[PDB]
C-alpha cells in the first residue's frame, strides 16, 4: 500500500532544477495573445499585433516575473521564512520603486 510517495520538498527541489536547466517557455501563447488583444482594445480599435511582438512581450513578462519571484523569495528568506507572501511582493515593489 506504499508507492514511496514523494515527501513535500523532494519534488519541489528537483522540479526547480529541471525548470532552471531549460530554455523553453512556460506560459501559453494563445491566452497571452487574447490578453494583449483585450488590453489593446482599451486604446485603439481594430488593431493587428505581430507574432514576434507578442513573443517578445511574453519573454519580457516571464523575465520580469522571474525577477519578482526571486526578490520575493529573498525577502522571505530574510524574514526567516521559506514560503512567499503578498506582503513580500508589496515590500519588493515598494523598495524597487514600482509603486510610483
Amino acid at each position: 500500500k506504499k508507492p514511496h510517495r514523494y515527501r513535500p520538498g523532494t519534488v519541489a527541489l528537483r522540479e526547480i532544477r529541471r525548470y532552471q536547466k531549460s530554455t523553453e517557455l512556460l506560459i501559453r501563447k494563445l491566452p497571452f495573445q487574447r490578453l494583449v488583444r483585450e488590453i489593446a482594445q482599451d486604446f485603439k480599435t481594430d488593431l493587428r499585433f505581430q507574432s514576434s511582438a507578442v513573443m517578445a512581450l511574453q519573454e519580457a513578462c516571464e523575465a520580469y516575473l522571474v525577477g519578482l519571484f526571486e526578490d520575493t523569495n529573498l525577502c522571505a528568506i530574510h524574514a526567516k521564512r521559506v514560503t512567499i507572501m503578498p506582503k513580500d511582493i508589496q515590500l519588493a515593489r515598494r523598495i524597487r520603486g514600482e509603486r510610483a
Binding site: 514576434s52 519571484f69 523569495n73 512567499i84
Partner: protein, 84 residues
Amino acid sequence: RKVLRDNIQGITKPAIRRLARRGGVKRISGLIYEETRGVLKVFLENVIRDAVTYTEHAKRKTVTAMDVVYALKRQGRTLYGFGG
C-alpha cells in the same frame, strides 16, 4: 463574445507555479496568483499603451516587434534577439 474574467484566468496557476519554481521558490502562497496577474496586467497595459502611441505616431495600425522593443527600452528594459 469575449469575457473579461477569461483573460485574467488565462494566466493559469500551474504556469505561475512553474515560473516561481524557475525563479527559485519552494512554496507559493494562494494569494500570490491574483497579485501576480494584476501586476502583469498593469505592466502589459503600460507597454501596450506605449506601443499604441508609437504606432499612432508612425501613422499605422500594426504593432511591430521593433516598436515593442523601443517601448521596452524607453522604460529601461533592453531586449536582444527579437529585432535589431
